[PDB]
Design a protein around this motif. Structure first.
Motif, mmCIF file in Angstrom:
data_model
loop_
_atom_site.group_PDB
_atom_site.id
_atom_site.type_symbol
_atom_site.label_atom_id
_atom_site.label_comp_id
_atom_site.label_asym_id
_atom_site.label_seq_id
_atom_site.Cartn_x
_atom_site.Cartn_y
_atom_site.Cartn_z
ATOM 1 N N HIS A 126 0.832 -1.196 0.000
ATOM 2 C CA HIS A 126 0.000 0.000 0.000
ATOM 3 C C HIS A 126 0.870 1.251 0.000
ATOM 4 C CE1 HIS A 126 -3.603 -2.397 0.748
ATOM 5 N NE2 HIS A 126 -2.942 -3.022 1.705
ATOM 6 N N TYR A 127 0.614 2.147 -0.952
ATOM 7 C CA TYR A 127 1.286 3.439 -1.036
ATOM 8 C C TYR A 127 0.264 4.537 -0.784
ATOM 9 C CZ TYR A 127 5.469 1.231 -3.014
ATOM 10 O OH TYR A 127 6.593 0.464 -3.216
ATOM 11 N N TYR A 131 -10.338 6.099 -8.103
ATOM 12 C CA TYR A 131 -8.979 6.596 -8.264
ATOM 13 C C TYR A 131 -8.819 7.246 -9.629
ATOM 14 C CZ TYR A 131 -7.311 3.789 -4.232
ATOM 15 O OH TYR A 131 -7.102 3.246 -2.985
ATOM 16 N N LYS A 139 -3.951 -4.662 -10.400
ATOM 17 C CA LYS A 139 -5.286 -4.867 -10.941
ATOM 18 C C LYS A 139 -6.296 -4.897 -9.802
ATOM 19 C CE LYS A 139 -3.283 -8.459 -11.416
ATOM 20 N NZ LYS A 139 -2.007 -8.917 -10.799
ATOM 21 N N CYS A 140 -7.528 -4.508 -10.117
ATOM 22 C CA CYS A 140 -8.599 -4.423 -9.137
ATOM 23 C C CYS A 140 -9.432 -5.700 -9.144
ATOM 24 C CB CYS A 140 -9.494 -3.212 -9.410
ATOM 25 S SG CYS A 140 -10.776 -2.945 -8.167
HETATM 26 C C1 LIG Z 1 -5.615 4.058 0.323
HETATM 27 S S1 LIG Z 1 -4.949 2.383 0.179
HETATM 28 C C2 LIG Z 1 -6.447 1.437 -0.196
HETATM 29 C C3 LIG Z 1 -6.509 0.092 0.530
HETATM 30 C C4 LIG Z 1 -5.315 -0.221 1.425
HETATM 31 N N1 LIG Z 1 -4.613 -1.402 0.935
HETATM 32 C C5 LIG Z 1 -5.758 -0.416 2.871
HETATM 33 O O1 LIG Z 1 -6.086 -1.529 3.285
HETATM 34 O O2 LIG Z 1 -5.786 0.534 3.654
HETATM 35 C C6 LIG Z 1 -4.157 2.508 -1.442
HETATM 36 C C7 LIG Z 1 -3.158 1.396 -1.734
HETATM 37 O O3 LIG Z 1 -3.844 0.161 -1.841
HETATM 38 C C8 LIG Z 1 -3.635 -0.432 -3.108
HETATM 39 N N2 LIG Z 1 -4.932 -0.759 -3.723
HETATM 40 C C9 LIG Z 1 -6.132 -0.151 -3.462
HETATM 41 N N3 LIG Z 1 -7.084 -0.732 -4.228
HETATM 42 C C10 LIG Z 1 -6.504 -1.695 -4.976
HETATM 43 C C11 LIG Z 1 -7.010 -2.581 -5.918
HETATM 44 N N4 LIG Z 1 -8.304 -2.561 -6.218
HETATM 45 N N5 LIG Z 1 -6.162 -3.477 -6.538
HETATM 46 C C12 LIG Z 1 -4.819 -3.488 -6.219
HETATM 47 N N6 LIG Z 1 -4.324 -2.605 -5.281
HETATM 48 C C13 LIG Z 1 -5.153 -1.726 -4.668
HETATM 49 C C14 LIG Z 1 -2.866 0.544 -3.980
HETATM 50 O O4 LIG Z 1 -1.730 -0.087 -4.520
HETATM 51 C C15 LIG Z 1 -2.447 1.662 -3.051
HETATM 52 O O5 LIG Z 1 -1.053 1.635 -2.861
#
Ligand SMILES: C[S@@+](CC[C@H](N)C(=O)[O-])C[C@H]1O[C@@H](n2cnc3c(N)ncnc32)[C@H](O)[C@@H]1O
Ligand SMILES: [Zn+2]
Ligand SMILES: [Zn+2]
Ligand SMILES: [Zn+2]
Lengths: 104, 94, 78, 245, 92, 101, 78, 103, 89
Positions: free
Chosen positions: D152-153, D215, D226-227
């Motif tokens: 997570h970034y 986003y 990927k989502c």
């Molecule tokens: C604001 S966070 C959102 C969710 C986070 N993983 C959490 O649990 O708090 C944003 C990070 O989660 C990852 N992320 C969010 N949605 C994603 C998705 N649908 N598929 C892959 N990575 C996702 C992105 O790579 C980003 O770095």
DNA sequence: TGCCTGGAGACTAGGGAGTAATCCCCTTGGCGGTTAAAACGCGGGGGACAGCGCGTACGTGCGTTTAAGCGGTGCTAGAGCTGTCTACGACCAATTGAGCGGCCTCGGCACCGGGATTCTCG
DNA sequence: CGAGAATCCCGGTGCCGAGGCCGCTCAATTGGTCGTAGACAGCTCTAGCACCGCTTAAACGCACGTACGCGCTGTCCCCCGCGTTTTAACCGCCAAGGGGATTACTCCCTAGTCTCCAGGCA
């Protein structure tokens, strides 16, 4: 005993213009070339408007000059329309002007 | 025999831009002036005063309907409306 | 009520001189009010000049001066 | 399920039941703030034009500064000099009026949020709060932190030169996910001269439904992600071979 | 009572530029009003110019400056030319 | 992992914000040195080798800005009467025709 | 060509002070000509007053007198 | 004692009489005209300064500025009619937005 | 020489604890001069139409009633009448 | 604060305006007759207004470039203020001719009627 | 394309306003004296112009997306041409009398002059 209008070569009077300058609360002193200059300017403007009025009277096949002829003579010249843009002439009418979208 | 609507209107535009007479009657205008000049009670009028008032009033009304027609043409219409008169008197500075 | 004496054909003839081809049905009540305001202003100035001049008769030069005060400058009446 | 307590506990990283491994955060903090801004020279006050009554509430009572205010339409919250005073409803970032949120597990893509009760459209949920970076530190810390193998970034670009980190300190808005069917979104509100990022709703979300936001897609490295939602037209990957920022 | 006018002078001007053309009383009154209005405009502008430079005498230079400010275009050029021609002939 | 931007303003909000911002203040909206060069260039056509003061150019700038603001205030009413939002040169020409210019 | 020194965001800023929400692409070229005509008229009258006063510098009272001649009275520079 | 103390005014009377005798308006000047005109000028000055002081207190200030004069003149029905063709320097305009432009 | 100290004397009577800038003082100077020129010019016009040689309080009053609006001219005439009544009594 | 230049206090002469008388011009009121113009329906075609679809021009946003401000210094044309004096305008006495008022006279132009031409529409 | 309503042309009649002519006042003309307003000269000194280095805030250019200006179509309301009936405007004449306008007389109000002294501007 020549007059000043005969000496200046004008048709408007000089002593009447000098009397109206001295009796009109414009200044304390009045020069001796100012009514000659002003009578020349008024005579030029009178001849300039009467030439166009006579041209309108010749165009409308008449002998006398009427306020409709004066209205046409003023409104058909651009400089006279700019000089007299806030003047209403009694019994003078308007100009014929129909917009190009109102007619087929 | 009937005319298409607009021919008699253009004919009236031509004949009243050709004529130079007065369009408003004299006794209703005189009674209007003598009614609304009641400012100072028991006045008295010459004929040339009312004759100048009628000239100035009709010149003002023609000069207002010209700009009303310009506003109506700018609104892509032909019929003049009171909002055109209001726009002309708003831009004119009244 | 002499403002109703400025009839509908008279306003229609003034609009035909003004170049208007087609006229709605609400122009007349606006035109009567505008004419009333203009005449009230000019008659107020003319009556003020008449009351200053110590006279009972409103002449034509008072009307010409009242129009000159507003920027109309009518010619033909002195 | 949230259970905000100041004592650090025995949950490693997932933050689903014990929130005290990292630290929380209030309104954001700055590093190199200088007095060059439009703060108190032309945005001294932007007062609304309202002629209220304010003596008749709960009976023939309209709420003060609704959707007819000059400031709510232009995405500006009022100051303390409002003619309504302490009855104005624009000041939502200052009185901390929030929405009822909860963080549990929904899908194996990660953690997120689901709505507790009914919540109408154009309703504020949460403020995005974090740590404000600057010009030089961003391109050094991103390559210092990419070699730490994180998933997570938490980076959001406020402007062309301002990127907010919500990793070391973050509020409850850090868990919200991505979907191609957004029901919430982000807006740019200007409070006290400073720009702040919020979260509004768009529809009538039922009680027990998802609350995510769209986003604006971005890649920074060579890899791709990927989502996992798949509403109706889920692209998953990025928008091709773009490289903008 | 005897009253001033410009009717004989307008008639003398009219019988030079158009040798066969009449004029009515309404047009003569309009011409009298025109001459009076242009006289008042030029005299008022000259009296306003005489006060700005703290002078007391209105001369042909102030009249020329009042004409040049008030008439537009080539009409002012021809008015200045006619006036200078009439003032030049008066001194000799 | 990418840095996402939040949103983008709808067209009109920043414009109305600038309307409020420039109707609140009282300042000079035109640069001073191009205006001075323009005034000197158009004043070379009437008399060669002139000389100007500073208040004489400041008064010109005040009058010019007031004239242009009044012209746009009438022209916006023309454009609203034409049932539009965008402002056209035909609206400027209609305003200058009805005003008497 | 110092008429191009009156830039596009300056005319846009004047229109934002005038209450205009959305601007087309020819308003700038119209406004430059309008400003040019107005400034030519006022500079012509001001240089006429200056040449009458036998000076060589153009003061601010000449500009105030020319603006009064156009009919636009200006308070502040007297 | 001065004539401004006799009439009870604050504007001077001798300067007004000198400007009437000096500015080429008529041949003779009476005795009640500079007093009458000084009273009219004092009333108009006091009205302008009263509305300017109200407009200055409405914005938490203690010094009257040309923007306060602009708001005081343009926010009045009859002073806007008297001063309709007058441009005040550093005055600005009145804040107003047409109702067909707001969302 | 100007009307600045008199504008201060008028300002300290209607609002005691306030000040005024020099630009506003110049605007008030221009306003006083403009209203003076308007009233004096109209009173000079009124004295020529009746072929009189003297400008009087009646001439100034007639120039006030023509120039000022309705509610303003009544108070101006009342103040001027009170001031010209206090001058002789 | 220095002070000096403009404002006040008396006194007198001359003409400007205020009052009264009377002429007679022009404004107001009234009665009748003719007919032109205003008032009132009526059928219908045309235009104002609403709804919809589409393509583009103008908005917001970011990075680069450019010249507007902001100070410091120097040189000089020209504004501004006194001195001389001379030529030009105010003022009055005597005089005469140009222009305003009153009176005839005739011709340009307005009304009317017949004949032929020109645009309008089904 | 041909009925059919406007419209131009030609002549005849006659009439009232433009124009010439004269008698006669009052204002333009000419001469001469005196006072003072501005034209010219010269000295001081002050803002206006010209250049130079630095900073940084505003202008410019490109990308992109979407709200709006413009064109098309449908409907139904409403203003216009026309015919008939009612009304008061306009002309003509008459008469009473009220106030504009002019003249003569007389009081009193302000310009001019001299002396004195404090109000306000640097
Ligand atoms: C604001 S966070 C959102 C969710 C986070 N993983 C959490 O649990 O708090 C944003 C990070 O989660 C990852 N992320 C969010 N949605 C994603 C998705 N649908 N598929 C892959 N990575 C996702 C992105 O790579 C980003 O770095
Ligand atoms: Zn509000
Ligand atoms: Zn509020
Ligand atoms: Zn997805």
């Amino acid at each position: 005993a020549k007059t000043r209008s005969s000496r200046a070569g004008l048709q408007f009077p000089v002593g009447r213009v000098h009397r109206l300058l001295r009796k009109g609360n414009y200044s304390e002193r009045v020069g001796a070339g100012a009514p000659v200059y002003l009578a020349a300017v008024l005579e030029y403007l009178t001849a300039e408007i009467l030439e166009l009025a006579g041209n309108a009277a010749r165009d409308n096949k008449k002998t006398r000059i009427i306020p409709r002829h004066l209205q046409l003579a003023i409104r058909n010249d651009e400089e006279l329309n700019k000089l007299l843009g806030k003047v209403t002439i009694a019994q003078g009418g308007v100009l014929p002007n129909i917009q190009a979208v109102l007619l087929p | 025999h009937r005319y298409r609507p607009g021919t008699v209107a253009l004919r009236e535009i031509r004949r009243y831009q050709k004529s130079t007479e007065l369009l408003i009657r004299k006794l209703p205008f005189q009674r209007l002036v003598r009614e609304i000049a009641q400012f100072k009670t028991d006045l008295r009028f010459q004929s040339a005063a009312i004759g100048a008032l009628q000239e100035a009033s009709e010149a003002y009304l023609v000069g207002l309907f010209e700009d009303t027609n310009l506003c109506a043409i700018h609104a892509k219409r032909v019929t003049i409306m009171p909002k055109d008169i209001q726009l002309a008197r708003r831009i004119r500075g009244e | 009520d002499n403002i109703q004496g400025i009839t509908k054909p008279a306003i229609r003839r003034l609009a035909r001189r003004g170049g208007v081809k087609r006229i709605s049905g609400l122009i007349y009540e606006e035109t009567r009010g505008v004419l009333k305001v203009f005449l009230e202003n000019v008659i107020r100035d003319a009556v003020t000049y008449t009351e200053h001049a110590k006279r009972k008769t409103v002449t034509a030069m008072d009307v010409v001066y009242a129009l000159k005060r507003q920027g109309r400058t009518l010619y033909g009446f002195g | 399920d949230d259970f905000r307590d100041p004592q650090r506990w025995k949950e490693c990283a997932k933050q689903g039941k014990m929130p005290c491994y990292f630290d929380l955060i209030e309104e954001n903090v700055y590093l190199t703030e200088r007095k060059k801004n439009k703060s108190h020279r032309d945005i001294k006050r932007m007062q609304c034009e309202c002629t209220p009554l304010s003596k008749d509430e709960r009976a023939q009572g309209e709420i003060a500064c609704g959707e007819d205010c000059l400031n709510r339409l232009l995405m500006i919250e009022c100051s303390s000099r409002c003619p309504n005073g302490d009855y104005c409803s624009n000041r939502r970032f200052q009185r901390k009026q929030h929405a009822d949120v909860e963080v549990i597990l929904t899908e194996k893509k990660g953690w997120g949020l689901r709505a507790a009760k009914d919540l109408p459209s154009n309703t504020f949920v949460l403020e995005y709060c974090g740590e404000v970076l600057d010009h030089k530190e961003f391109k050094a810390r991103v390559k210092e932190y990419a070699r730490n193998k994180n998933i997570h970034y938490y980076f959001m670009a406020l402007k062309n030169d301002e990127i907010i980190d919500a990793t070391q300190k973050g509020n409850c808005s850090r868990f919200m996910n991505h979907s191609c069917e957004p029901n919430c979104e982000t807006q740019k509100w200007t409070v006290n001269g400073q720009l702040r990022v919020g979260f509004f709703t768009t529809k009538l979300v039922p009680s027990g439904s998802e609350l995510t936001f769209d986003y604006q897609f971005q890649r920074y490295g060579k890899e791709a992600q990927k989502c996992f939602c798949g509403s109706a037209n889920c692209r998953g990957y990025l928008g091709g071979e773009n490289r903008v920022s | 009572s005897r009253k001033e006018s410009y009717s004989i002078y307008v008639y003398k001007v009219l019988k030079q530029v158009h040798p066969d053309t009449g004029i009515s009383s309404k047009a003569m009154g309009i011409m009298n009003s025109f001459v009076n209005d242009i006289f008042e405009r030029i005299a008022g502008e000259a009296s306003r110019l005489a006060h700005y430079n703290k002078r007391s005498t209105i001369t042909s230079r102030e009249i020329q400056t009042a004409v040049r400010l008030l008439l537009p275009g080539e009409l002012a050029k021809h008015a200045v030319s006619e006036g200078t021609k009439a003032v030049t002939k008066y001194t000799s």
